[PDB]
Amino acid sequence: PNFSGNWKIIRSENFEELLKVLGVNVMLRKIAVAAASKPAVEIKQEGDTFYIKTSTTVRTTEINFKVGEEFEEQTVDGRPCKSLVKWESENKMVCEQKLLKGEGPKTSWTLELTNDGELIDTMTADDVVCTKVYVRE
Numbered sequence: 001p002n003f004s005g006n007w008k009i010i011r012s013e014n015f016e017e018l019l020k021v022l023g024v025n026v027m028l029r030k031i032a033v034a035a036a037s038k039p040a041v042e043i044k045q046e047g048d049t050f051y052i053k054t055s056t057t058v059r060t061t062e063i064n065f066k067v068g069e070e071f072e073e074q075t076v077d078g079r080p081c082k083s084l085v086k087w088e089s090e091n092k093m094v095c096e097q098k099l100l101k102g103e104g105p106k107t108s109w110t111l112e113l114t115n116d117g118e119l120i121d122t123m124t125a126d127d128v129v130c131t132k133v134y135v136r137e
């Protein structure tokens with residue numbers, strides 16, 4: 001199925017805690033979890049090729065990738081990483097990340113589409129999991 005769309009957040013669980021495991025200091029966390037930082041996600045999918053733009057009121061970030069091909073992005077806390085996405089199933093992709101420099105928590109993300117059209121974004125840092133759920137506007 002098709003991940004394309006303009007997605008708006010309807011659920012967010014455990015995001016502040018993910019930030020703590022990543023070592024984001026408290027001043028930045030308050031900003032990051034504020035409504036001004038609420039994410040909107042735009043996806044354009046063509047087969048295995050994806051464009052994903054994630055924007056807030058003050059920030060915008062775009063990734064471009066094809067499933068199975070390595071690309072560069074940033075960890076949630078903004079460290080450059082090499083990422084690789086694979087299909088876990090027909091409706092679910094999983095991305096492993098490796099830091100370009102230094103050491104840190106093991107991080108990953110997954111995106112999956114439910115039959116009822118919800119987009120579930122899961123982010124992990126070691127033993128902590130954050131889940132965000134979106135629907136199409």
Ligand SMILES: *C/C=C(C)/C=C/C=C1/N(C)c2ccccc2C1(C)C
Binds near residue numbers: 009035
């Ligand atoms: C991933 C979530 C981020 C970056 C921010 C979300 C913040 C909020 N806030 C402050 C809020 C208040 C009411 C309902 C929903 C939210 C949301 C989780 C968007």
